[PDB]
């Protein structure tokens, strides 16, 4: 866990609560990604919740993360934030 990667990693997308930012992170597993995302978005704190940017389903399982295709959109939320669908308009 400290160093190294069990096999190749898969590409994935990430977006903040404002569903405005887009960060493409790659990880072999779920745990790895989550850890990366935080670093990418340089989030102030670590306590966060990763979910799907489609329905808002929290991904806390590896078996479910191994099924997700490539460039999978995700949604990060801080201690006190919920997921939200695609806004009807920006303005």
Swiss-Prot record:
Could you state one GO biological process linked to this protein?
Answer: negative regulation of cold-induced thermogenesis
Q: Name one GO molecular function term.
A: protein homodimerization activity
Q: In which tissues is it expressed?
A: Expressed in omental and subcutaneous adipose tissue (at protein level).
Annotated ranges, domain CIDE-N: 8-85
Record keywords, A-Z? Activator, Apoptosis, Lipid droplet, Nucleus, Transcription, Transcription regulation
Query: One Gene Ontology cellular component annotation?
Result: cytosol
Q: What is known of its domains?
A: The amphipathic helix mediates embedding into the lipid droplet phospholipid monolayer, promoting phosphatidic acid-binding, thereby facilitating triacylglycerol transfer.
Q: Describe the family membership recorded for this protein in Swiss-Prot or TrEMBL.
A: Belongs to the CIDE family.
**What is known about what this protein does?**
Lipid transferase that promotes unilocular lipid droplet formation by mediating lipid droplet fusion. Lipid droplet fusion promotes their enlargement, restricting lipolysis and favoring lipid storage. Localizes on the lipid droplet surface, at focal contact sites between lipid droplets, and mediates atypical lipid droplet fusion by promoting directional net neutral lipid transfer from the smaller to larger lipid droplets. The transfer direction may be driven by the internal pressure difference between the contacting lipid droplet pair and occurs at a lower rate than that promoted by CIDEC.
Q: Which disease is it linked to?
A: In omental and subcutaneous adipose tissue of obese patients matched for BMI, expression levels correlate with insulin sensitivity. Expression is increased 5-6 fold in the group of patients with high insulin sensitivity, compared to the insulin-resistant group. This observation is consistent with the idea that triglyceride storage in adipocytes plays an important role in sequestering triglycerides and fatty acids away from the circulation and peripheral tissues, thus enhancing insulin sensitivity in liver and muscle.
Protein name as catalogued = Lipid transferase CIDEA
């Amino acid at each position: 866990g400290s160093s190294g990667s069990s096999g190749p990693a898969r590409p994935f997308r990430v977006s903040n609560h404002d569903r405005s930012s887009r960060r493409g992170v790659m990880a072999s597993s779920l745990q790895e990604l989550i850890s990366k995302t935080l670093d990418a978005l340089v989030i102030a704190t670590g306590l966060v919740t990763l979910v799907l940017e489609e329905d808002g389903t929290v991904v806390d399982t590896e078996e479910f993360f191994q099924t997700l295709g490539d460039n999978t959109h995700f949604m990060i939320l801080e201690k006190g934030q919920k997921w939200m669908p695609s806004g009807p308009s920006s303005g």
